[PDB]
């Protein structure tokens, strides 16, 4: 890549060693890497004079000299190859920075480059079992500390990755969920939340509205006037007489009689299934889209605002952005906590590829139009996949036993979701928390064991003082 550096540092290129002697690999994040790469020889004086850039380089432990900038760029690119920290998202960041620096050369080099072995989840398991071994060693050498370490290990073992999934109703989510699980499940007027958890029993626990939740719904019926019509139709079959506190149906074999208008009285269905997907301690939350808004929407945004560690939003390949979908996506973009949620264009078939990408382009243009500032770059927060659930669901047992699993998108979507269990920010944050816990328990053990040596030294000093006193008494 000496030709690249000749291209971008035409005359000021220095005699430098092309290898990442990076000593941390976490010294700087991807946006900072993109900024350092955008210090092309035509912007470098301005960048070095910019106070913010100087602050950034002091944060990264850089100088503002030419040589160190080029060396850092070398190291960033070699990490981009070898340790493979960057994705096309690094290219996203450079495209964002193109507001200032029209750095097409490094952009193309990063694009057209044999990337490397990826290796994510194996490395995750390796690091996690390293930390488990460290925890065991700390437990070996105090009872309170050992109990604390055991409880920490219990917490970090098999822990609660929640995928909330949402979308407008006609876009369809139950069909995609069935295909992700690679078998059928519940469902192929509306609504109720669905929680696919992993559990020993194969329950299907069901929750109905409370007295007060139904009072809220009837109050809102006065104003909605379509919910009022549906509530008039519903109250003819009076299961109302679904009352004061507790309706916890513990089991069922997925009866679809609730599809005959009783689901309007159901709010929350809590399945505890056995599926390898959930066997990996994953948990999915399927959410209503469009009606019985009053409290089902409140509990939808409760479940999504609660733990949910990832968000998948589904839009059918031929939905015209679905103004409610657009408002939801806008709310998502303004929420800084979301941190790169995901979009799936469900039913990827029925629509020509490279026309699907036009659909994605229209989606992103609409979202940019709803955010008029540099806020537009917040749409670069979204990832887009294009999956057809029918083909993957067919390959398992059905008609298309010829491989439509791939060429649909489901294999890639599954790979994405499994990558989010080390590449996702949540897994790395959990590993960092485990490391901090091990460091602090290590510090406690250090205190405990250094105090013993200090006491022994004090005892030796006291013995020496006693010997000196005895000698003084003999002299007297």
């Amino acid at each position: 890549m000496k030709e690249l550096f000749q291209k971008i540092w035409q005359n000021e290129l220095q005699f430098l060693n092309f290898d990442a002697k990076f000593q941390d690999k976490s010294k700087l994040d991807t946006a900072e890497c993109a900024i350092i790469l955008s210090v092309n020889k035509d912007n470098y004086e301005r960048y070095f004079l910019l106070k913010e850039f100087q602050e950034l380089c002091k944060k990264i432990d850089l100088r503002v000299d030419i040589f160190s900038m080029q060396n850092a760029q070398i190291c960033i690119l070699n990490l981009f190859k070898s340790g493979f920290i960057s994705k096309q998202d690094l290219l996203k960041a450079l495209k964002i920075l193109e507001k200032i620096s029209k750095n097409t050369e490094i952009f193309d080099f990063i694009l057209q480059e044999k990337v490397q072995s990826i290796d994510q989840k194996a490395l995750f398991q390796n690091d996690f079992k390293e930390l488990n071994t460290i925890n065991l060693e700390l437990q070996k050498l105090d009872e309170n500390l050992k109990s604390r370490l055991q409880k920490t290990l219990e917490k970090f073992q098999n822990l609660e990755f929640n995928i909330a999934i949402t979308g407008v109703m006609n876009a369809g989510k139950s069909s995609l969920l069935n295909a992700l699980l690679k078998e059928d499940f519940l469902g192929v007027e509306t609504a109720n939340l669905t929680v696919l958890s992993y559990g020993k029993s194969e329950e299907a626990k069901i929750y109905f509205w409370d007295k007060k939740e139904w009072q809220n719904i009837l109050e809102s019926s006065h104003f909605n006037a379509d919910l009022k019509e549906f509530i008039d139709k519903l109250d003819k079959s009076v299961n109302i007489e679904p009352l004061i506190q507790n309706i916890a149906l513990c089991e069922l074999k997925n009866f679809s009689s609730a599809k005959n208008k009783i689901s309007a009285l159901i709010k929350k269905i809590e399945i505890k299934s056995h599926l390898e997907f959930l066997k990996n301690n994953i948990s999915i939350v399927d959410t209503p889209g469009l009606d019985d808004v009053v409290v089902q929407r409140e509990i939808v945004t409760n479940e999504y605002l609660r733990e949910s560690d990832f968000l998948i939003h589904l839009m059918n390949a031929s939905q015209s952005l679905t103004q409610k979908d657009a408002d939801f996506l806008v709310h998502c973009l303004l929420n800084s906590r979301l941190s790169k949620f995901l979009i799936v264009l469900t039913k990827a078939d029925l629509l020509s590829k490279k026309d699907l990408e036009e659909v994605i382009v229209y989606t992103k243009e609409s979202l940019k139009s709803r955010l008029v500032d540099l806020d537009e770059n917040l749409v670069e927060k979204i990832d887009f996949l294009c999956v057809s659930a029918k083909m993957a669901s067919d390959f398992y047992k059905g008609l298309a036993s010829k491989e439509s699993l791939q060429k649909s998108g489901m294999q890639e979507f599954e790979n994405y979701l499994f990558n989010e269990l080390y590449a996702g920010e949540k897994s790395k944050i959990a590993l960092r928390a485990y490391k901090k816990e091990l460091h602090l328990e290590l510090k406690n053990i250090l205190s405990e064991y250094e105090m013993q040596n200090r006491l022994i030294k004090e005892n030796k000093q006291g013995v020496s003082e006693e010997n000196q006193k005895l000698l003084l008494e003999l002299q007297k």
């Binding site: 690999k25 976490s26 460290i134 790395k428 590993l431 091990l438 460091h439 290590l442 064991y449 005892n459």
Partner: protein
Amino acid sequence: EKVLQSLKNQDANILNSFEENLEKIEKLKQLEMGLLNADKLHH
């Protein structure tokens, strides 16, 4: 002299305890560098 010899036997036991404590401290020191490397691997 006898009290000093009794203290010397007790200090053989105490010397062994001190050496064990030093060994534990060295183990913990090793663990901390291992932990820093594990952190380094993350990103």
